[PDB]
Write an enzyme that holds these catalytic residues in place. Structure first.
Site, PDB file in Angstrom:
ATOM      1  N   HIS A 185       1.737   1.468  -3.167  1.00 12.96           N
ATOM      2  CA  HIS A 185       3.098   1.563  -3.425  1.00 12.96           C
ATOM      3  C   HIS A 185       3.268   2.480  -4.737  1.00 12.96           C
ATOM      4  O   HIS A 185       3.897   3.447  -4.738  1.00 12.96           O
ATOM      5  CB  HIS A 185       3.757   0.345  -3.431  1.00 12.96           C
TER       6      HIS A 185
ATOM      7  N   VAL B 234       5.747   4.978   3.679  1.00  9.59           N
ATOM      8  CA  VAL B 234       6.316   4.189   4.760  1.00  9.59           C
ATOM      9  C   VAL B 234       7.440   3.987   5.417  1.00  9.59           C
ATOM     10  O   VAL B 234       7.642   3.702   6.612  1.00  9.59           O
ATOM     11  CB  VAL B 234       5.565   2.730   4.838  1.00  9.59           C
TER      12      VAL B 234
ATOM     13  N   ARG C  85       9.801   6.735   5.371  1.00  9.54           N
ATOM     14  CA  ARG C  85      10.137   8.361   5.820  1.00  9.54           C
ATOM     15  C   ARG C  85       9.088   9.250   6.004  1.00  9.54           C
ATOM     16  O   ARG C  85       8.067   8.876   5.255  1.00  9.54           O
ATOM     17  CB  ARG C  85      11.200   8.869   4.965  1.00  9.54           C
TER      18      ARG C  85
ATOM     19  N   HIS D 191       8.189  11.142  -6.550  1.00  9.00           N
ATOM     20  CA  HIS D 191       9.091  10.203  -7.248  1.00  9.00           C
ATOM     21  C   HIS D 191       8.360   9.206  -8.161  1.00  9.00           C
ATOM     22  O   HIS D 191       8.610   8.924  -9.024  1.00  9.00           O
ATOM     23  CB  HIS D 191       9.735   9.775  -6.058  1.00  9.00           C
ATOM     24  N   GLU D 192       6.873   8.827  -7.692  1.00  8.84           N
ATOM     25  CA  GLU D 192       6.301   7.977  -8.420  1.00  8.84           C
ATOM     26  C   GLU D 192       5.860   8.474  -9.506  1.00  8.84           C
ATOM     27  O   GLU D 192       5.668   7.859 -10.590  1.00  8.84           O
ATOM     28  CB  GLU D 192       4.992   7.311  -7.397  1.00  8.84           C
TER      29      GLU D 192
ATOM     30  N   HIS E 272       7.188   6.777 -12.872  1.00  6.34           N
ATOM     31  CA  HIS E 272       6.241   5.613 -13.329  1.00  6.34           C
ATOM     32  C   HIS E 272       5.090   6.427 -14.132  1.00  6.34           C
ATOM     33  O   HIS E 272       4.479   6.156 -15.121  1.00  6.34           O
ATOM     34  CB  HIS E 272       5.537   4.833 -12.361  1.00  6.34           C
TER      35      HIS E 272
HETATM   36  O1  U2P Z   1       6.617   3.693   1.084  1.00  6.19           O
HETATM   37  C1  U2P Z   1       7.689   3.849   0.415  1.00  6.19           C
HETATM   38  C2  U2P Z   1       8.071   2.438  -0.222  1.00  6.19           C
HETATM   39  C3  U2P Z   1       9.098   2.526  -1.491  1.00  6.19           C
HETATM   40  N1  U2P Z   1       9.750   3.539  -1.550  1.00  6.19           N
HETATM   41  C4  U2P Z   1      10.964   3.603  -2.318  1.00  6.19           C
HETATM   42  O2  U2P Z   1      12.508   3.473  -1.680  1.00  6.19           O
HETATM   43  C5  U2P Z   1      13.276   4.549  -2.031  1.00  6.19           C
HETATM   44  C6  U2P Z   1      13.746   5.066  -0.865  1.00  6.19           C
HETATM   45  O3  U2P Z   1      14.763   6.192  -1.102  1.00  6.19           O
HETATM   46  C7  U2P Z   1      12.625   5.345  -3.146  1.00  6.19           C
HETATM   47  O4  U2P Z   1      13.293   5.841  -3.962  1.00  6.19           O
HETATM   48  C8  U2P Z   1      11.438   4.388  -3.419  1.00  6.19           C
HETATM   49  O5  U2P Z   1      11.878   3.840  -4.598  1.00  6.19           O
HETATM   50  P1  U2P Z   1      10.924   2.966  -5.655  1.00  6.19           P
HETATM   51  O6  U2P Z   1      11.165   1.382  -5.226  1.00  6.19           O
HETATM   52  O7  U2P Z   1      10.554   3.074  -6.862  1.00  6.19           O
HETATM   53  O8  U2P Z   1      12.296   2.646  -6.446  1.00  6.19           O
HETATM   54  C9  U2P Z   1       9.611   5.038  -0.853  1.00  6.19           C
HETATM   55  O9  U2P Z   1      10.231   5.757  -0.699  1.00  6.19           O
HETATM   56  N2  U2P Z   1       8.422   4.840   0.068  1.00  6.19           N
END
Ligand code: U2P
EC number: 4.6.1.19
Length: 190
Positions: free
Chosen positions: A34, A72, A74, A83-84, A88
């Site tokens: 994750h 997982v 999309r 994004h990660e 982070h």
């Molecule tokens: O496989 C994964 C697992 C979590 N996410 C998270 O859910 C938000 C979807 O827009 C994403 O922003 C992301 O947020 P995170 O929890 O930091 O906030 C995914 O997109 N894909």
């Protein structure tokens, strides 16, 4: 930062909460990454100003990342990595550049095989109830320190499911340390 939370998620469980629409995770049967979250004084450091995500810096890791760090929810893996990194990774960039950060997560995943550590003790996933103490105990025996267990409650049945397992590391990104926070109760489905 003073430590890291290396978070792995169980795809089927994560997607089980998506009651509408598609969810690629529904067809995966291993723990995937994750994220790698820098910590400070017991809290996650996020959105630190830093370098923009650059795919060219991790081009050599594309095979491993598509396999171990898939999105997982999309079908867009790169968006998830970007994004990660922005949320982070930038927070530990003072010591780990983008390439080193993603390499670290890959190495951590290859060295922290959760299912492999549970299967022999009849604690693998089977959709039945598991004990928080038992699971934490099996992982501590195999890896040396206590992991963090994260759960989510189903809105319809109110049953708790294990969704993520956290391995805690010191600031060097290699020394395992005990985790101290679980969102799971005494029992949960796994
Ligand atoms: O496989 C994964 C697992 C979590 N996410 C998270 O859910 C938000 C979807 O827009 C994403 O922003 C992301 O947020 P995170 O929890 O930091 O906030 C995914 O997109 N894909």
């Amino acid at each position: 930062f003073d430590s890291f939370w290396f978070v792995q998620q169980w795809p089927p469980a994560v997607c089980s909460f998506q009651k509408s629409g598609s969810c690629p995770g529904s067809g995966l049967r291993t723990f995937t990454i994750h994220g790698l979250w820098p910590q400070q004084s017991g809290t996650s450091l996020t959105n630190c100003p830093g370098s923009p995500f650059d795919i060219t810096k991790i081009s050599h890791l594309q095979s491993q990342l598509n396999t171990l760090w898939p999105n997982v929810l999309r079908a867009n893996n790169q968006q998830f990595w970007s994004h990660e990194w922005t949320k982070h990774g930038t927070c530990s960039e003072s010591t780990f550049n983008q390439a080193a950060y993603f390499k670290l997560a890959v190495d951590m995943r290859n060295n922290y095989d959760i299912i492999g550590a549970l299967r022999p003790h009849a604690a693998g996933p089977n959709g039945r109830t598991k004990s928080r103490q038992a699971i934490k105990g099996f992982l501590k025996a195999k890896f040396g320190k206590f992991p963090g267990l994260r759960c989510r409650t189903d809105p319809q049945t109110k049953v708790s499911y294990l969704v993520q397992v956290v391995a805690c590391f010191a600031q060097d990104g290699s020394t395992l340390i005990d985790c101290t926070r679980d969102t799971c109760g005494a029992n949960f489905i796994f």
